[PDB]
Structure formats: structure tokens, C-alpha cells
Amino acid sequence: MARKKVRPRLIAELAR
Amino acid sequence: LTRGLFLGLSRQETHQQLADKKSLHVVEFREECGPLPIVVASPQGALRKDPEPEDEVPDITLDWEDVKAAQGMKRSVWSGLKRAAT
Amino acid sequence: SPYKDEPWKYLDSEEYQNRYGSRPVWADYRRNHKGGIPPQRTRKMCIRGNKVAGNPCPICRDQKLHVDFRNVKLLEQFVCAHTGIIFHAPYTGVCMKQHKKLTQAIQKARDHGLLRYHIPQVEPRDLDFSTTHGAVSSTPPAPTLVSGDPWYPWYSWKQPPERELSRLRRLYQGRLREESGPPPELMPEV
Amino acid sequence: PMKGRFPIRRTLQYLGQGDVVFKDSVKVMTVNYNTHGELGEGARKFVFFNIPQIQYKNPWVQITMFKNMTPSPFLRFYLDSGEQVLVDVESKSNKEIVEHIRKILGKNEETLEKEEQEKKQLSHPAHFGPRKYCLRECMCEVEGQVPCPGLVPLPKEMTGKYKAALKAT
Amino acid sequence: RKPTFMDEEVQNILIKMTGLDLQKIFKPALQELKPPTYKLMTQAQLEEATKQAVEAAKVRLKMPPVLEERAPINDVLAEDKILEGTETAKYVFTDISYSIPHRERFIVVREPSGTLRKASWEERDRMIQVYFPREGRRILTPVIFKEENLQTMYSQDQHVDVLNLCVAQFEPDSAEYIKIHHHTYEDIDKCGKYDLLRSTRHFGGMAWYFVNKKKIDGLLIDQIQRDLVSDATSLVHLYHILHPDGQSAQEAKKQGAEGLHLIKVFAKTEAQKGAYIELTLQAYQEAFITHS
Amino acid sequence: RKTRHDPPAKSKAGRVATPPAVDPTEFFVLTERYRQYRQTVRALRLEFMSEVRKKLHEARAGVQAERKAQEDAAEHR
Amino acid sequence: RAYRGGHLTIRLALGGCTNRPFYRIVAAHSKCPRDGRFVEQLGSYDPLPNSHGEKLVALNFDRIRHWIGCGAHLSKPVEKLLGLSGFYPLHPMMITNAERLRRKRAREVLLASQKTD
RNA sequence: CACGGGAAACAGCAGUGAUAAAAAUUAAGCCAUGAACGAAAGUUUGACUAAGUUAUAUUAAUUAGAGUUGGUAAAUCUCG
RNA sequence: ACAGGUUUGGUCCUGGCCUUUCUAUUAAUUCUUAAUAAAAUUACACAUGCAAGUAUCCGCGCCCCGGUGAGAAUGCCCU
Ligand SMILES: [K+]
Ligand SMILES: [K+]
Ligand SMILES: [Mg+2]
Ligand SMILES: [Mg+2]
Ligand SMILES: [Mg+2]
Ligand SMILES: [Mg+2]
Ligand SMILES: [Mg+2]
Ligand SMILES: [Mg+2]
Ligand SMILES: [Mg+2]
Ligand SMILES: [Mg+2]
Ligand SMILES: [Mg+2]
Ligand SMILES: [Mg+2]
Ligand SMILES: [Mg+2]
Ligand SMILES: [Mg+2]
Ligand SMILES: [Mg+2]
Ligand SMILES: [Mg+2]
Ligand SMILES: [Mg+2]
Ligand SMILES: [Mg+2]
Ligand SMILES: [Mg+2]
Ligand SMILES: [Mg+2]
Ligand SMILES: [Mg+2]
Ligand SMILES: [Mg+2]
Ligand SMILES: [Mg+2]
Ligand SMILES: [Mg+2]
Ligand SMILES: [Mg+2]
Ligand SMILES: [Zn+2]
């Protein structure tokens, strides 16, 4: 699933 | 309303008159009696041997209220209410 | 009232014919309500204790009428002759307590055959009537069934070797419990 | 329906009475017809009458119209394996085309009736649950079993309140 | 090669024995009435509509099967004496699956004594109804089938309904079905109400019961009084097929007659009370000659 | 029910477990029953496993499947 | 719902009103709630005797062996329930509880008679 | 979002302050079922089971008050 | 909707508002008992007790159950 307003979260990958 | 009702009811066409002007039998198919072809009126005089022309799609004027009720879309809170005796 | 012996006697009596006549009981009764659309639910009961509440319902205004399964003439008036369905409470005007009595009485009467109702023709349950299959026919006994031996060797109780008992006592020393022997074969009744 | 030339063809019964079910390999149906000439009477009536019925039974099949591009009306079917079926209609009537289509690519009567037969077993009568998916909702709705305590109150000996009272006493 | 109810010979005899009355077979029932539908038909189309009703009538007249009493089930799959007093009630296990016919399902009961045994027919039919409900079948035995209630229905000539209730409620090879059907057949014989089951699909059952109980005196008298002779001799012809090794059937081979004389053979040979039969047949003959 | 990050209680922070007593004769017999019982169920589990393989194989490449595939192909041509 | 892990399990799901239990034999993911979404409902189990003194149990045998064949775990009560039907051998804990009942009853009989004398 | 920062967490059961027209017990048990762990007897579980409280709904009975009475719309007189 | 009240000295037509039906919450007045269902102001701040342990050490499990509707036109169906 996806939408046209997806925000590129980066902190989640940074924390990982 | 009173004049319109009597004018409409006085313009009613009976089965016998329909049979005479068509010269064909009129058969009543009761739903509770199964596929039994009950005959209600017979055309007095000459009986036409030519069958009615069968149209695949009839050209009739339908009222939107009748079709809406038939398809089950009328969901008012006053149509199905329980009322007193006649 | 002296009519409990035969409730249908009142229906055949001259008093009923004189008052109601050919028309049903609920023909002359009209229910007073708040406007054009009557409430979908009538009074719960109009005979509370010993007080008659206002304009009574057709059944609660003459106490000589008894709602039982014996009399069919009274119950026929509350069932549609052509459609064969039970009239709802707003259609007649009876109180809800008596309406419940009518439905139970009508249902009981149809169970005893005193009243006619539609019986659809029903096809037989099964397509082929065969008793040959093993689900209904008796199967050969098991070799362990005829002998009387339990179906599995470990279903019965077997005395363990004393060496194994000593090993368990050493392993579970300190928190040991009193051991028991073979169970009784049959349990008596208190 | 009041508006329209033939209002009867816009009711649920008319959309549901057309029995033409394509096979799973049929994806695209292309219909070309002419708006003039007596030869195109069968094609035009087919578009005006039967196409709503065909699409209703095949929601996943694309149906596209093209008017006045080819002098001879025809129908073109595109399969999943790239196969092209060409149906030529130049004098066939409205009824003939539907019978012709039903045989080249329609499904057989035995296949349809066995398909819904296997669909019935999904709603097994022996299950319990909500009314929308199962017949009964609880075991108390079966005659003979212990009824729901809401309708008929249970005897005191079976109530847990009485069971706990004697155990504590 | 004993005669059976499904033979083509007996079926064809009984098909024309019951007759075909469109008005009685299609009777308006007490259901949710809907407005009728009218259409215009010619004379030719009317016969087509009539013959379709005849075919629908024939399908509606499929006689229910009749069988003998079923043998009781007494089978023990296993015995476990370790569970003698663990539980007080008994467990009933029913295999449910839409693909398995109801005659092959496994219904197994765990009695409190610990014996794993198959369920008897009385409980086996109850369990099938519980998990596979269908119209008209009560889980418990209805009170309508008591002896007292049957007489009330019989006094109101509800014989056609009682048979229709019995086929829906009980299993055709069950014990209760047989005793109810035989009791109904015995009562209509006593009151001479054979006219009620003329066009009813249940007419084959009572005719077959009479031909096996050697009680045709009552049935033959009514048919002659109804001026239905062509089917009456067919009933006698049925008798010879079912009971060949008898004096009556021997006469049919000796004399070798036809028509009403076939009834005369039985009337003077095996008929218990042939006085009425011969006099009524005489009454029919003189009346028919006068009518002709 | 608690979560991973919440702290445990204070009163029940000293005890760990208190196993019950063991009847020697009863425990050995019970252990022997389980060893045979688990063995029996495992064989049934593998027998049912092989049944599923047979059912799935016949639905994919069974003889009737080839008849069906050829019949529709022959009809289409 | 998307769960991290869990194993397919055949278990009993509670139902009915208070003081009137009713269990449905269902097969669902172990991490889903007891009355939550399930794969397929198999049978039923009425815990209370009816007027005939019977506790009705329903089993979908061809489907039950299908889920067991594909690796479905069984809980304690369904194993006891299947063991009674005969589909499985009697659960070892079912027998031991029976033996404990006899010994307790035997102690009860002796204790009553000892006080009597 | 949560490396970090503000900052020091009941949107788990029960309960409290504030606030709102909105008012359940700071209670019992793992006997049943469900989940976790153990080979196993078994243990934990405010999920749940059985209870406490409230006309919020439905039923039965042991229970009698409220509203309305110009018209739509069932129903009144005498005084102020 | 089977419709009803209301424009005007008055009739017809067009056109609003409202009545009559059912469900929930709060409040007023009133209240005897039993059973079942349900329990609902607030993503505001929280005292105290409890809600994840099991197990011959390893390990496995630890918003999984449960709670809420803040957020997002989020989504439903489907590959
Ligand atoms: K527990
Ligand atoms: K108006
Ligand atoms: Mg509950
Ligand atoms: Mg928390
Ligand atoms: Mg809280
Ligand atoms: Mg918070
Ligand atoms: Mg407060
Ligand atoms: Mg509240
Ligand atoms: Mg307060
Ligand atoms: Mg307090
Ligand atoms: Mg506790
Ligand atoms: Mg304990
Ligand atoms: Mg436990
Ligand atoms: Mg384990
Ligand atoms: Mg409670
Ligand atoms: Mg007042
Ligand atoms: Mg004006
Ligand atoms: Mg005015
Ligand atoms: Mg309040
Ligand atoms: Mg209470
Ligand atoms: Mg270990
Ligand atoms: Mg939730
Ligand atoms: Mg809110
Ligand atoms: Mg919001
Ligand atoms: Mg926004
Ligand atoms: Zn009353």
C-alpha cells in the first residue's frame, strides 16, 4: 500500500 | 382528488372488453396456484389464430418510484409502519 | 366465570351472537393515539391488579372470553383467512400481554391440529437409501476388543522397576511425596 | 426510470437477465459498427441492448466502442495468450450475435452450475456465528439444548453465585 | 424376483390409477399472496400452457419411497473400563462435512460406562437435523403425532396433511413412519375416505399397503361407485402380479377373460365379501347400459 | 498484560519458583505414557502430512487434470 | 493484524452468556485473541447436558486431519475432546486424573466406613 | 520519526485531582477457556471466569407515579 | 409516507417551516424485586497496590492479550 503524500522518514533508519 | 379518482376508475378496462378488442384468450397465472393457466375471459365471436408479436424488449413507461421499491432501495421510516385496521 | 369447563360454549351462546354478530370482536374497537401514525406498540397491559385502565382492549373488556387452544372460533378471528399469518397488535388493538397469549395459544393450537395451516410438500431427506455402509452396519470386532484387553498396553497400570524408583527418589530428594500403589479396579458408591 | 428511449434496459433485472459469461482468458472485446446502412442494424441493436448485459456479467473485461472506422461491422476479442478472435457481423440480427458469442467464447452450462455448487459449501450450515455469515448465533437457538439465561432464567443450583456460596460455607 | 415398488410395471399401473386432477393438485395454499400476472394467449398457446402444467403435475406427483423397517444398530467400537465414573453425561460426536452423504456419516456416542458405541437410529436422525437443519423437521418429536391428536385430525379429514407431515418429519424406513402411515391407511379404510387421496401423491402408498394386506374389498367398491372401471381392473391386475400363487390368479389363467370379468374372478374367488362387489358391479352394468 | 519496558513489582521480587512434590511411582508411569503417546501422535501427524501431499499432487498434475486441460484446448481449436 | 510469529493452533473459543458456556472448535493463529479472527471453524462443543443427558460435540474430521497434516498444534482440551471421540488415543493426563479419582474415592469410602465402626 | 532533546509518562484493572450537562469495586479466584514456559506432574496471568455497583435497554412479577385535555391530536368542570 | 397543521376577505397553484414514527446520552419528577445485555466527558495531570513469567543455570516469552480514537481523507475491495 502507498499514498501520494508519503514523507521520507529518516530518523527511524538512523536509530536502527 | 375525488374527481381524479372517479375519472380514473370510470376509465377502467375489464378483462372481457380487453379480450373482445384483441380476440384472444386472457390467462391468469396465480402465483399460489402454480403454473396452472386459469382462464378468466374468452373472446366471444371470432378467435384470432395469429399470435401476438413477441417483442424482445418492451417499450413501456416506468415510474421511478415503482422500480426503486422493486429493487429494494426505499428505506423510509414511514413506508413499513404498522397501522390500525382498515 | 362459569365457563372454564368449555370456553367455546360462550362463542356458541346467544349472548355472543347478540352483541358481536357475524363480525369479529375487534371490528368495533378503535384505539386512541397521539395523531395520524399510531404507536407501533400498544399498551403492555390494561388489567393491572384490579383496576381497568381506560378503554379496554377487545379481549380485556369482556372477561368471559378465554384465550385457550380448545376454542378455534375465537382464535380464527385473529388469523388472516387468506394469507395465513398472525395479525400484529396494532392491526387489532389488543394489549401486548394478551397478544403474547394469542400467539402462544395459536402456536399450541396448530401443534394439536385444531387449526389449519399450510404444510409444504417436502422431498425425502436422502437420495439413496442404503444400509450397506459401515457407518450404520456393524464392523468386525478388534482383536483387542474380543479378548477384553485394553486397546493399548499403556492404558493399564504397571508397577515400575525398583531401580527406576530409587533413581527418582535421589533426583527429587527433599521435595518427595508419599507414593501410592495400584489403583482400585472398581470404585464403590458412598 | 422515466428518461431515455427504453427505460426498462436500465433496471437491475434487465442487467441481470443477460447470460453471457466469458472464459477466464478473455480480456478485451472491441466492437466496431456503423451508424448508417441497413446492414448494421444487427450491430447497432447489439450495442444498444446486449452490451450492458455483457459488461454486467464480466466486470473485469474491457469493452470499447469504435464508430464509423470500418465499412463492415465486426467484433474483435483479445485473449490472454495473445490470440485474436475475429467475429464478422454484416446481416446477423441482435439475437444471432449473442448466440454466436456465447458459443465461441462463452462458458458451458455445466461449468456455471458446478461453479456455484462449490460456492455453496463455503457457507456450511453446521457453523455458528454472526447472522451475516452463519445461520445460528448460539447453541441455545437449538431446540432441546439449555436456553439462553436472558430469556429463561436458569435454576439456582446451576448459578455460579449459589455454587460459590456453598463452597465458602 | 419379487415385485418391488420401483418397477416400471407397478409404477405405470399406479400412475394412471391415481388420475390427474389439475384443480385439486394445484390448490391455492394459505401463504403470502401476491398479485397475479396476466398475459394474452391464442388457442394453440393455451394447450402449450396446459401441457406444461401436466408435466409440472407429474413431477409434483413423485410418490415417496416405501421401505421395510430398518434394523437397529448395536455396535461397540471399543470399551474403556478406566473411565467408568469420570463423567456423568455421555458425549455424542458427529462427523460434519458437506461432501459426505448423510447415510455414511459417523455418529459415535461415549457412554458414561466408557464404551465407545455407535448411535442408535433414534438419536442419529436427531443429531443430523441439529447440525443440518431443514424445513419442516422438528428436533424433538412433535405432539401432533400422538394417538389422541391424530384422531382430532382424522375427524377433520386431515388425512392428506398427516401423511405430508410424516414424510417431512420422520425417515421413510424408520419405525415411527411405518406405524403412522399404516394407522392412517387403516383409518381411511374404516371410514371409506379413499376420495381424499385421489390426486394426492400419497395414493401409491395406500394402494401398495392394501395389495400386501389382501384388503381390496373396500377400495374396489368405492372405485366402481365413482364410475372408474378402467383403472379398477388395473388394481385387480396388480393383485395377480403381487400374489401369483393363489386361487384368484389361477382363474385368470384358467378362464382368461378381460374387462369387468377380471373383477368377477376376484369377487367370487378371494374377495372376503364378494356380495357387495358383485351387486355393485351389477349396479354399474345396468346403469351404464341405461346411460348408453 | 505488562510490557517489556515496565518495571516488575516489588513484593514478588524475591521468590522465583516453588516446584511441587513428585510422586515417584506415579511420575515414572506418567512419563512412560507420554513417551508412547507422543510417538503415536507423531506417526499420525506424518500420516496426515503424506495425505496432504497426495491431495495436492492430484489437484495439480492428476490424470483428471490432464483430461480437463486437453478437453478445453481441443474445444477451443 | 500483522504478528511477528506464532503457530497455527486448533483451540476452543468461548461463547454464550454468563452461566451458559459454549465452545467453538476453531483454528486460528496463536497470537490472535481468543474470540478474534480465525482461519476456519471446525465444530462445536456444548458443555451442558440437554434433556436427553447428552453433551453434543461436532467435528469436521476431513478438515481436522487437514490442518493437523499441515502442522497445527493442539491445546490441552481439544486433545482430551478428540481422545474421547476415538480419533486420537486417550490423553495420558486423562487417564491419570481418572486414577486419582478412584484413589480419592477409595479413601473416601474407607474414611466413611472407619468412622461408622 | 526519536540518535538526540524537552522532559520524568496508568490511552492495563481499580482509584484520585482538575475539567465536563456526563459519576462501576482502590474487591475474589486461576475451578473453566485462552496465552507464555517446562519432557513432565505444574506454575504465572486485573485476558477471562463467577460476583459487587447504576431504571441505561429487554423480560417476569412482588411495583404507582408522570404528562397531556383550543386546533393538527385521544380528553374537564368550578374558581382566581 | 396513506398523509396532517399553517400564506389569503376568499379560491386554485407554487413553495418553506412544524406535527405524527423509532434509537441513544444528559437533566427534571418518580421508584418495589429478580435475571440478562451494556457501562461512554476529557490523547488533561496522576498518590498508592497490582497487570510476565516459566525453567536444573542456557534459553524462550515479555502492548501477544489488553487500552484508546489522538493522528491521517485517511481508505474499501483486489494483484
Ligand atoms: K487457568
Ligand atoms: K405543506
Ligand atoms: Mg460474555
Ligand atoms: Mg503502559
Ligand atoms: Mg484506568
Ligand atoms: Mg497519559
Ligand atoms: Mg473525581
Ligand atoms: Mg452514563
Ligand atoms: Mg457523585
Ligand atoms: Mg466504597
Ligand atoms: Mg489475584
Ligand atoms: Mg493453587
Ligand atoms: Mg492450567
Ligand atoms: Mg509445551
Ligand atoms: Mg459481572
Ligand atoms: Mg399532573
Ligand atoms: Mg398570498
Ligand atoms: Mg387569516
Ligand atoms: Mg442521571
Ligand atoms: Mg443486577
Ligand atoms: Mg531443561
Ligand atoms: Mg482493540
Ligand atoms: Mg471523543
Ligand atoms: Mg480526531
Ligand atoms: Mg489534514
Ligand atoms: Zn387487555
Swiss-Prot record, chain C:
The modification Phosphoserine is found at residue 1. GO terms for cellular component: cell junction; mitochondrial small ribosomal subunit; mitochondrion; nucleoplasm. The keyword Chaperone does not apply. Component of the mitochondrial ribosome small subunit (28S) which comprises a 12S rRNA and about 30 distinct proteins. It is found in: Mitochondrion. This is Small ribosomal subunit protein mS40. One of its GO terms (molecular function) is structural constituent of ribosome. Keywords: Mitochondrion, Phosphoprotein, Ribonucleoprotein, Ribosomal protein, Transit peptide. Belongs to the bacterial ribosomal protein bS18 family. Mitochondrion-specific ribosomal protein mS40 subfamily. The gene is MRPS18B. GO terms for biological process: mitochondrial translation. Its main location: mitochondrion. The keyword Ribosomal protein applies. The chain holds residues 49 to 238 of 258 of the full protein. Coiled coil: none annotated.
